[PDB]
C-alpha cells in the first residue's frame, strides 16, 4: 500500500523526479542508438532529452572523451544536487543518505589517494550531495582519523563517514584499496536495509524490495568474482558477507570469493537471473548490467513511494554509463562491444 | 552418484587379486557374489578383463599413475563440454548420446564387449605412447568441436542483424527487397530518392509536410512502401542538391531519415549479405552437428582406454603380484551406488589395508577440498581396494 | 607494422577509456601506485644479419608476477578486470613487432 | 636485550639522595657519554646475534644425536649407501599421520613406518635409492625435517661419533657467551640509569639556553647566576612554579 | 646486449594507464622516478616532454624500447629527429584518435633519403 498517506514533502520529491523521467532516454532509444553508426543520428536522439541540453551547446557530430564527461557532470547538478535543497522532511533525508553513500566511496578514494600521493582538482562524476567544491576537499585534507570525526560533525546533516572513521580506528578495515572498498560497500548495502525497515509502513516496498535484494546478490557475487584468482585473504570480508532473506547465502558467496574456482555457484543460483555462469569474463559483465537494469523500470509502475525514487537514482548511474559507452564507438565509426551485445534494458 | 544423468546406468569398475576371497560371504566365489548377493541381486555384471601392458620400473611407476589421473580428468571434462554443445543445439533433448550407439552398439552393451580396442592402440607399444596417443586424440577432437560451435554462434548473430536490415526496425535498416523502378528512381542523376523513417503518430505529419521540406520535391511520392509496428517507412523523390535541405528539415519535424539510393550495386550487395549469411550458418550447422557426434564416440572409446589403463597400473601399485587380476565392470541400477560401494569395501577391503580402511559411500566431486577425489596425483582419501566410480 | 600497432593501440585505449569514465573515478591514479614491476620485459640477443651484428629482442612474460589489486571496487572492479585482459594481449603485439625496429 | 625495563619520570635534581648519586654535581662532557654507549652497543649486537646462531645449531645437533643412533640400529647399512633410509624429526606423531596419508595415496605402500617418542617425534621412512625426490616433495610440503642423512656432520665412522664431539664444542661455546653477557649486564644496568639521567639533563640545559628559535619566541629571559655547590642541594628542592631550576 | 628490460612510454594518459596495468613500465624503488611519462594533451608544455625525452634516452639506460605517440612526437620534432641511436629504440606509433602519418615517424624520414 502506498498513497495511503498524505505528504507535503513526498509530493515535491516525487513530482520533480517524474518531471525529469519524461525527457529521459527510454529503452527503445538505447536499442536504436546501438544500431547506429551515423554521427548525425546519435546527436538527434540525444538532443531531445535531458542530456540533449548540454549537447546543443557545442555542436559536435563526433563526440570526443571530454564532451561526454562534461555533459554528465552538468546533468547530475540539475538532477541530484538541486533537488535535495527544495525537498524537506524524511524524503529529503532519504535523498541525502543515498547521495552521501556514493560520496563515501569517492571521498574514501581521495583520502586513500593522498597516502599514495595523487593529483586532485576535479574528480570524476558520481552522485554526491554537494560538489567537489564544498565537502569532498575539506574531508580530503584530513588524513588523520581524529580530525575526520570533527569534520563530519560540522556537516549538518551528518555523513555516514563518522561511523566509517570509528571503524578504521579499531582496524576492522585494514589498508589496501580492494579490501577497503569491499568493507565500504558492505556498509553501503547495510544502510539501505535499515532504511527500508523503518520506511515501509506507509509507502510499501514491493518492486523496491525485489530490486534491493537482487542488487545485493549481484554486488556480492561480483566482488567475489574479482577476488577469484587474484589472491584472497580468507578471514577478511572480501566475500562481502551481509544479511539476506536467503536469495544468496554466506556460504555460497565465500566459496566463490576464495581462489579455488567456484563458477558452479552462479548457475545454481540462477533460475530467472541473467548471469548463469560462464567461462567468459566479458559475457558475465554484460549480464550483470541487464539484470540490474531490470526491475528499476518496473518500480516506476508504483508512485507516491520511496520505492520509485530509489530505483530511479540507481537507473540513472547505469544510463550515464550507457551513454558514454555507445557514444564513443559511434564517434570513430566502430560498433559497441558490451552495449551492442546487450538488448534488454 | 550422478554428474550428467539422463537415464543411463551407472557403473563401478573394480579390479582384485586372484587370491582374494570375500569375508562378508566366506568361502564364496567372487564372480558369483557380484551377480547373486550384491545389492539384493539387482546387480548386472558384465565382463571387463583388461590385458597386460608394459609396466615401467619403480621410479617410472609413480610418474605413470600421476599422469593417468590428470589425463583421465581432462577427457572426462572435455566429453562433458561436447554433450553440452549438443544439448544447446537441441540434438540431445529427452535422451540422446549417453545410450545412443557407439559404432552401432549402445553404451551399456559396448562396455560389456569392451576388453581393450586394437583399433590403433597396441600392446607391442610402450605405456607412455599409449597415454600420449589417447590424450592427444581427445584434446584435438574437443578443439575442433569447440571452434565450430563458436563460429556457429557468431554466424547466428550476422543473420539476425541481417533480417532486421531487410525489414524490422529502422535505425540501420535500408530496404533492398521492395525496390521498384518508379518508387525508386535514379537512372541519370537529377532525381534521387530519400527514405524517411517516420514514427506512426508522425505518419500524417509526414504526408502533410513532405513537399515543404525542400524546394523541388516530386508530387505525390509520399506513400508507405513498407510499414512496421513502431515505424512507417516512406519514399519521397526529389532533386539531388536539395537532399541536404530535405534531410535537415526532416530532423526538425522529428523524423529520422534513412539514406538509401537506388544505385544498382547497393541493392544487390545488401540482398547478397542476407543470403550469404543464411548459407554460412546453414552449411556450418550440418557439418557441426555431424562433427560433434563423430567426436563424441571417439572421446568415449578414449575415456575408457585411460580408465582401463589407470585401474590396471594402480592395481599393480597397490596389491603387487600377481600381475594377473580378476577384473569386472558391474552395472549398478541408478541410486544404488552408495549401497553397492559399501558392500564391496567390507568384503575386499582387508586386502589393501587392515587399518587403512574405513567405511565410505558414493562419489562427491568438489573444489572445497581435495579429499574424496580418489586420485594418485593429489591427496585424497585412500580407498581400501581399487575401485573407481563412473557416472553417466 | 606501424599501421598495425596503431590500430591495436587505439582499440585497447578506447576500451580502457570507456571503463575509466563509467566507474566515476580515475583508474590511472590507482594504476600508477601499483606499477612497480613489469610483466612484459625483453631479453636481448645480437644476431648476424650479414657480417654486422644487429639488436634483436625476444619478449618474456613473468609467470611469477601476480595480478595487481585494482579490482574489487564493486561494479567498477568488474570493468577493470575485463580491461587488463584485452590490454596484456594488445601490449604483446607492440613489443614483438618493435624488435625489428631496433 | 637485557630484559630490564626503563625507569622514567627522571631524577636530575641534587635535593634527592639519588639526585646527588646518579647525577654528579660537576659539569657534563657529552663526548665521554657517546663513547661509553658506542662500545656497549657494538658488544651487544655481537653477543645477541652470536647466542642465537650458536644456540640454534646446538639444539638441532642434540636432536639429531638420538636420531642417528636409533636410525643406524633400525643395522648392516648404518654407514651404507646402497640402501636409502630417511631419518627425520617431526613436531608430533599427529603431523606424521598426514604424511603417511600423502605417501600411501601418492607413492604406494613402499614405506615401513616406525616412530619413537622424543621429549618431538622421531619418524622413519625407508625406501629405494631412486625414489628419493618424490618422498622429498611430500616432506617439504608438511614441514618435516626428513633428510636422507640428518646433519652436515657425518665424517667419522659412525656418523654419530663426529656429531658427539661437535655437540661438545657447541655446549661450551654457548656457555662462554652467556657468561660474557651476564658479567656485562650486572656491570652496566646501574650505569645506564646514570647516563640516562645525565643525558636528560643535557637536553634541558640546551633548551633553557635557547638552541632553537622556538624556545626564544616562548620565553625571552635567560639569566645567569652562581650557586655554591655545598648549597646546590636547596635550589633543586623547589623546581620553580613556572621557572626551571634544573642547573649544573 | 642485455642490461635493459623496461619499455618506457611517452603517451596520452589512457594509453599509458592501460599499458602499465598490462605491466611494461614502473615507478622504481630506489630512484623514485617514474619510467613512464603521462601527458595531458595540449595542457602540458612542449618543454616538459623534452626533459622527459632526454630522461628515457640518456639519463636512463635501462630503457630498451621507447614508445612515443605521433601527436606528441611532432611537437618536439627537433629533439626526436636528432636522436638517431638504437639504444633505446625510437618507435613512433599513432596517438589516440589520430591516424598513421609517415611524417610524424622520425625513422621513416631518415630511411627514405639515402637509400
Curated annotation (Swiss-Prot), chain B:
Positions carrying N-acetylalanine: 2
Cystine crosslinks: none
UniProt entry keywords in alphabetical sequence: Acetylation, ATP-binding, Hydrogen ion transport, Ion transport, Membrane, Nucleotide-binding, Transport, Vacuole
Membrane topology term: Peripheral membrane protein
Subcellular location, record wording: Vacuole membrane
UniProt keyword annotation of Cell inner membrane present: no
InterPro entries xrefs: ATPase_V1-cplx_csu (IPR004907), Vac_ATP_synth_c_sf (IPR036132)
BP GO terms, sorted: endosomal lumen acidification; Golgi lumen acidification; proton transmembrane transport; vacuolar acidification
Entry GO MF terms: ATP binding; proton-transporting ATPase activity, rotational mechanism
Primary localisation category: membrane
Keyword ATP-binding: yes
GO CC terms: fungal-type vacuole membrane; Golgi membrane; proton-transporting V-type ATPase complex; vacuolar proton-transporting V-type ATPase complex; vacuolar proton-transporting V-type ATPase, V1 domain
Family from the record: Belongs to the V-ATPase C subunit family.
Cited function: Subunit of the V1 complex of vacuolar(H+)-ATPase (V-ATPase), a multisubunit enzyme composed of a peripheral complex (V1) that hydrolyzes ATP and a membrane integral complex (V0) that translocates protons. V-ATPase is responsible for acidifying and maintaining the pH of intracellular compartments. Subunit C is necessary for the assembly of the catalytic sector of the enzyme and is likely to have a specific function in its catalytic activity. Reversibly leaves the enzyme after glucose depletion, causing the catalytic subcomplex V1 to detach from the V0 section.
Name of the protein: V-type proton ATPase subunit C
Swiss-Prot record, chain C:
Subcellular localization(s) per the UniProt record: Vacuole membrane
Disulfide bonds: none
General function of this protein: Subunit of the V1 complex of vacuolar(H+)-ATPase (V-ATPase), a multisubunit enzyme composed of a peripheral complex (V1) that hydrolyzes ATP and a membrane integral complex (V0) that translocates protons. V-ATPase is responsible for acidifying and maintaining the pH of intracellular compartments.
Subunit structure, interactors included: V-ATPase is a heteromultimeric enzyme composed of a peripheral catalytic V1 complex (components A to H) attached to an integral membrane V0 proton pore complex (components: a, c, c', c'', d, e, f and VOA1). Interacts with RAV1 and RAV2 components of the RAVE complex, which are essential for the stability and assembly of V-ATPase.
UniProt miscellaneous comment: Present with 8500 molecules/cell in log phase SD medium.
Family membership: Belongs to the V-ATPase D subunit family.
Identification of the protein by name: V-type proton ATPase subunit D
From Swiss-Prot, chain D:
UniProt modification remark: Glycosylated.
Localization per record: Vacuole membrane
Membrane side Cytoplasmic: residue ranges: 1-248
Residue ranges that the Swiss-Prot or TrEMBL entry lists as coiled coil: 40-68
Subunit structure: V-ATPase is a heteromultimeric enzyme composed of a peripheral catalytic V1 complex (components A to H) attached to an integral membrane V0 proton pore complex (components: a, c, c', c'', d, e, f and VOA1).
Note: Present with 55714 molecules/cell in log phase SD medium.
Stated family: Belongs to the V-ATPase 116 kDa subunit family.
Role: Subunit of the V0 complex of vacuolar(H+)-ATPase (V-ATPase), a multisubunit enzyme composed of a peripheral complex (V1) that hydrolyzes ATP and a membrane integral complex (V0) that translocates protons. V-ATPase is responsible for acidifying and maintaining the pH of intracellular compartments. Is present only in vacuolar V-ATPase complexes; enzymes containing this subunit have a 4-fold higher ratio of proton transport to ATP hydrolysis than complexes containing the Golgi/endosomal isoform and undergo reversible dissociation of V1 and V0 in response to glucose depletion.
Name of the protein in question: V-type proton ATPase subunit a, vacuolar isoform
Organism: Saccharomyces cerevisiae (strain ATCC 204508 / S288c)
Residues of the full protein shown: 78 to 362 of 840
Swiss-Prot record, chain E:
Membrane topology qualifier: Peripheral membrane protein
Additional detail: Present with 4050 molecules/cell in log phase SD medium.
InterPro entries: ATPase_V1-cplx_f_g_su, ATPase_V1-cplx_fsu_euk, ATPase_V1_fsu_sf
Principal place of residence: membrane
GO MF annotations, alphabetized: proton-transporting ATPase activity, rotational mechanism
Highest taxon listed in the record's lineage: Eukaryota
Origin species: Saccharomyces cerevisiae (strain ATCC 204508 / S288c) (Baker's yeast)
Lineage: Eukaryota, Fungi, Dikarya, Ascomycota, Saccharomycotina
Keywords: Hydrogen ion transport, Ion transport, Membrane, Transport, Vacuole
Coiled coil location: none
Pfam families the UniProt entry points to: ATP-synt_F
Protein name per its UniProtKB record: V-type proton ATPase subunit F
Family: Belongs to the V-ATPase F subunit family.
Subunit structure as annotated in this protein's UniProt entry: V-ATPase is a heteromultimeric enzyme composed of a peripheral catalytic V1 complex (components A to H) attached to an integral membrane V0 proton pore complex (components: a, c, c', c'', d, e, f and VOA1).
SUPFAM superfamilies: AtpF-like
GO CC annotation, single: membrane
Transmembrane regions listed in the UniProt entry: none
Primary role: Subunit of the V1 complex of vacuolar(H+)-ATPase (V-ATPase), a multisubunit enzyme composed of a peripheral complex (V1) that hydrolyzes ATP and a membrane integral complex (V0) that translocates protons. V-ATPase is responsible for acidifying and maintaining the pH of intracellular compartments.
Record has Ion transport as a keyword: yes
Compartment list: Vacuole membrane
Record GO biological process: endosomal lumen acidification; Golgi lumen acidification; proton transmembrane transport; vacuolar acidification
